[PDB]
Amino acid sequence: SPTKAIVRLREHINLLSKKQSHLRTQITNQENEARIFLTKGNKVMAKNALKKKKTIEQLLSKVEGTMESMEQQLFSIESANLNLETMRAMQEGAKAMKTIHSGLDIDKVDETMDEIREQVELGDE
């Protein structure tokens, strides 16, 4: 159902959120490894650690892009459900106004209305 898709989007979103926390940790850790390589005067290994930092940041970007597509999909479903709730209310509402409109069981007033209606329009063409 629509509620089926909603719950799984949430579950997927929640898991991606933890991947994101994890990736930020590793980003930090690569930064700190680079500083330590420098205090040992190993300029090459520090650059290698910063390049690895760059790739994790790229992957964190992909994680957040997946999350964002899922949040938009969720919103689209919830809005569409609200729009459908309106349409069903309107349907049932129009049924109720039709019952009320013909709630005069004897003496057809509405046929006389349509007669007078056409007389009024007889300049229009």
Domain boundaries, the chain: 1-125
Can you tell me the distance from the alpha carbon of 27 to that of 20, in angstroms, rounded to the nearest whole number?
Answer: 11
CB 9 within 8 A of CB 70: yes
Distance between CA 83 and CA 61 in Å, rounded? 33
Amino acid at 99: T
The CA distance from 16 to 59, in Å, is 12
- Confirm if 62 and 33 have CB atoms less than 8 A apart: no
Instruction: Report the C-alpha gap between 123 and 125 in whole angstroms.
Output: 6
What's the resolution in A?
A: 2.2
Q: In sequence order, what are the residues at sequence separation of 6 or more whose Cβ sits closer than 8 angstroms to the Cβ of residue 71?
A: 13
